[PDB]
Structure 1
Amino acid sequence: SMEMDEKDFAADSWSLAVDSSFLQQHKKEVMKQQDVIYELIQTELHHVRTLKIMTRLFRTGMLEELHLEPGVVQGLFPCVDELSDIHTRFLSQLLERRRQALCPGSTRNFVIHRLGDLLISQFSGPSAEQMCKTYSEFCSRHSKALKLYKELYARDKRFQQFIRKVTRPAVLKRHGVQECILLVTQRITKYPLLISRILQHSHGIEEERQDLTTALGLVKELLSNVDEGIYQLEKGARLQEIYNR
């Protein structure tokens, strides 16, 4: 992540990110809603950072330093460029909504009142179709990526040394290859929990309550479609094993 966004989301909550004199101006219900919206954006920033570790540190590092057989790097990191484009675009929209909401003279005091419309846009139309297509492909290739990683780590000296080198820094403690893959697979199922809690504190404006109710329904339809479109791929599985599913 870039320093400006890391500092804007360094605090454990929106109530600790804004100036205390600005916090004092809002009612408790507004503070509760803003704290959950801040968690959705903060966790989206971290999810985009996970995808940048996968594309820049791991994938690009393996292409530039190791002599792997063709198709091996794509097998370890399926769909990572498409996932990076989807979420960097979504994060850009969330951060622009926050930036427009800033008070003049401040880089930290804001209230986002209209998130629902942004979530409906993300989770409908062509962007929802692309999220469904990409996650159905990624999640169906998840077992295969983990197995290929385990094989290379145990049999290839140079691969093991590369992984130990780039994952040595303390800032990579939670972000080994297999950990990144599961953080990405689990991201999509965090959205309903976050949206439902924002909705619980968004009754003050009826149009906002209706828009977040619509967004929650669209996210659950996307998740149901991805879940029904998954079938784990296995290297070396024969056609007979497949058509006898």
Structure 2
Amino acid sequence: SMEMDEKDFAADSWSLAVDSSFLQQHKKEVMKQQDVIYELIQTELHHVRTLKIMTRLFRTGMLEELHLEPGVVQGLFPCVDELSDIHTRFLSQLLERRRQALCPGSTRNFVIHRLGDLLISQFSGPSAEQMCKTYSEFCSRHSKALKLYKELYARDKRFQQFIRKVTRPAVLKRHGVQECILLVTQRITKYPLLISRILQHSHGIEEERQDLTTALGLVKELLSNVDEGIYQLEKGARLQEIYN
């Protein structure tokens, strides 16, 4: 992540991120709504950061430092470039919505009143088809990636020194290779929980309540399609095992 966004999302809530003199001007219902929107953006910023650790620290580091057999790095980090493009673009839209909502003279005080339309756009049309195809591929390759990692760590000395080196810093404590893979798989099922709680505090404007209800339905349809499109790949699986 970049320092400007890390500082904008350092606080534990929207009510602690804005100035207290700004917080005081709003009704409790607005504060509750903004705290959940802030958590959606903060966790999306962290999710994009997990993808950058996968692409830039692990993937590129293995290609530039190690002599792994061709196709091994792709097996450890399936679809990471596609996932990075999807979520970095979505994060850019969320952060631009917050930025346009800032008060003049402030880099911290804002209220986002119109999130529903952005969520409908993300979870419909070509962007939803791309998310569906990419998570169906990623989640079907998840078990294979973990097994390949475990094999390389146990048998390859240079791979083990590389992993121990790049994951030594305290800021990587929760972000080893296997932890990144499961963080990505679990990201998509967080969205309905966050949207449902934003919707619970968005009844003041009927157009917004309707847009968030449509967005929640689209996210659930996407998750149902991804879940139906998963079949775990296994290295060395035989055709007989697959068709049976």
Listed as ranges, the gaps of 5+ residues in structure 2 are none
TM-superposed CA distance for 1:144, in Å, is: 0.2
TM-superposed CA distance for 1:189, in Å, is: 0.1
* Distance across 2 between alignment mates of 1:233 and 1:71: 15
State the secondary structure of the residue aligned to 1:232: coil
Q: Does 1:159 align with 2:159?
A: yes
TM-superposed CA distance for 1:150, in Å, is: 0.1
* Distance across 2 between alignment mates of 1:174 and 1:241: 36
1:217-239, Cα deviation, whole Å (9 max, x unpaired): 00000000000000000000000
| Identical counterparts, % of pairs | 100
1:49-85, Cα deviation, whole Å (9 max, x unpaired): 0000000000000000000000000000000000000
TM-superposed CA distance for 1:12, in Å, is: 0.1
TM-superposed CA distance for 1:92, in Å, is: 0.1
* Distance across 2 between alignment mates of 1:143 and 1:208: 39
TM-superposed CA distance for 1:104, in Å, is: 0.1
TM-superposed CA distance for 1:216, in Å, is: 0.1
* Distance across 2 between alignment mates of 1:44 and 1:202: 20
* Distance across 2 between alignment mates of 1:131 and 1:55: 18
* Distance across 1 between alignment mates of 2:51 and 2:235: 24
How many residue pairs end up in the alignment?
Answer: 244
Q: Report the equivalent of 2:79.
A: 79
* Distance across 1 between alignment mates of 2:181 and 2:126: 25
TM-superposed CA distance for 1:43, in Å, is: 0.1
Matches within 5 A, 1:20-39: 20-39=20-39
1:144-191, Cα deviation, whole Å (9 max, x unpaired): 000000000000000000000000000000000000000000000000
Q: Report the equivalent of 1:170.
A: 170
TM-superposed CA distance for 1:119, in Å, is: 0.0
Listed as ranges, the gaps of 5+ residues in structure 1 are none
User: Which consecutive aligned stretches of 4+ in structure 1 deviate over 3 angstroms post-superposition?
Assistant: none
* Distance across 1 between alignment mates of 2:130 and 2:14: 31
Q: Does 1:43 align with 2:43?
A: yes
* Distance across 2 between alignment mates of 1:170 and 1:103: 36
* Distance across 1 between alignment mates of 2:173 and 2:236: 33
* Distance across 2 between alignment mates of 1:234 and 1:165: 29
Alpha carbon RMSD of aligned pairs, Å? Answer: 0.1
* Distance across 1 between alignment mates of 2:28 and 2:237: 57
TM-superposed CA distance for 1:47, in Å, is: 0.1
